[PDB]
């Protein structure tokens, strides 16, 4: 049993995409399907639902008149046409099937049995921008120095130190989404305070969505 | 309009019993369904129709309906059980058929001795002050449980505008870490004497300080 | 001494409505406390209720026994889904404790055939029900077969019931209906239940001896 979803990505506000949810190893034509989203760190929210017959289609309030459910049982695939997308629509969108079909007249509801892996939809009015890498100088026997990777879009960014030689004490924090729609993160390595005036520390920042590669050298201050 | 009330956090020790509750008006008549979501993973159905346990779900998971309160019970709690748990009902008695979730209850398993946070505070760099931008970086690592609060201070006055804190994240050493950024203008960085990052974890607060006159 | 039903009528106590609580093996007459649902917490007509009241009024013996054990009499069907918000208990969904609402196991309601022979030394009162979905979509979700029927027969009773799929007024949140039937079994007789859907089988019967 498995549900494969895709079709997601980055959309500019007011835009549209179509998510798909393909089925394998079960008779997709007899199960009732669902779409459930999850904000970048928030909780679960039901988007919409459809019967196996394609007869009943219900939606949540916040997506009515903007999202449409469809399914082609002939292709074992469920669809979510998302029009007039907004910044608050940014979330991970899961498809899921109900254990047994809903018995409406008798009030019988069963849970959601199998879920998709997730497909991420970001609605941001931000052009893809390379990051500005600023040095976090060591304070004047284990010193702390790092790299501030500020104002990039979208995710992700990979940070390495000394081109890969220094991996002990290296620690790259998760990124934060600022008000301007741009991300920023930091990666700090803890080194002996003695190798400050000898060993050279250079962090390697790579942002593939912009083909930007920055190598900044982190030294103390005078 | 119908609302499923749910506690946000529950902490249990290895081997004990944890009870997650879900409150709602006539929750048992509707049928409450429970889901287990581990960090980065899809949800997992662990209980449907109040008491019914899906296949492959261990008998350690059970459910009861005490009127307007539903409870998910996990026995012999282990570290694998640590996850976010959501409850679910269907509602046809509040408008068109709509589905309602709970806020989710994070189950912390307390499978490691407590760890004090290692705080490092960086002032805005010269390069950054040269780009007409200012960011203070406050870096927290090696603490446990992963629950921490960060307050910034102007001089000795609380600042709450322009602060950006990440949710605690798991490290390799099974401890947690998080970062917090204070974005200012270069003038504000110079107009004050000393800024402060107060990081509070398990009652004991740590404070680091940076200043432009340095 | 009479029978003091606390908060149920006869139909509420005899069907096993979850609201009734707490052992009488003889009673002169019955004290029926009224209720709004008319005893039937699931909407439905009770066929020959006065006839059953009149013959429940004075009994000298009254044993309740499991005519069809829940855990062994229904192996090809699902005897665990049959609860409703119309008949609640302790906040959750429940059902009449003397009946079982059978529902298709998987996507098939294979033909049901179950017989009970009166081994007792007295008459046996048997209660069952016929369910009627509100839409044919509910019929297939409940019983898979659209051409369902129910046959109940003994030596003195015989009737074939057919599903009456109709959208009735919303009573107790339900626009389906559920009729209730009964009959007495003579001390040497056999009652049989045939069904391809819509049958709410008996779980508990009553062996009784009446007076006059």
Numbering used by the authors:
A (entry chain H): 2 to 141, 147 to 228
B (entry chain B): 1 to 214
C (entry chain G): 57 to 78, 81 to 83, 83A, 84 to 90, 90A, 91 to 116, 116A, 116B, ...
Anything the authors wrote about it?
Influenza virus hemagglutinin protein (HA) mediates cellular attachment by engaging terminal sialic acid groups on glycoproteins and glycolipids. An insertion at the RBS periphery in H1 HAs (at a position designated 133a to adhere to H3 amino acid numbering) creates a steric block to H1-H3 neutralization by RBS-directed antibodies. We define here a previously unrecognized class of RBS-directed antibodies that are abundant in circulating human memory B cells (Bmem). Members of this class have a common motif in HCDR3 that mimics many of the authentic sialic acid receptor contacts.
We have now determined the structure of K03.28 bound with the HA head domain of A/California/07/2009 (H1N1)(NYMC-X181), (H1 X-181). Its 19-residue HCDR3 projects into the RBS, making extensive contacts with conserved sialic acid coordinating residues. In particular, an amino acid triplet at the tip of HCDR3, 107-E-G-W-109, mimics contacts made by the sialic acid receptor. Polar interactions between sialic acid hydroxyls 7 and 8 with HA Y98 and H183 are approximated by the carboxyl group of E107. G108 does not directly contact HA, but its positive phi angle orients W109 to create a pi interaction with W153 of HA and to emulate contacts made by the acetamido group of sialic acid. These include van der Waals contacts with HA residues W153, L194, and V155 and a hydrogen bond from the ε1 nitrogen to the carbonyl of V135. K03.28 is pitched away from the 190-helix, with minimal contacts. K03.28 coordinates K133a, present in the structure, with HCDR3 residues D101 and Y111. In the structure of K03.28 Fab complexed with H1 X-181, it contacts R226. Superposition on the HA heads of these 2 HAs indicates that Q or R 226 can be accommodated by K03.28, however, only the guanidinium group of R226 is able to donate a hydrogen bond to the carbonyl of K03.28 D107.
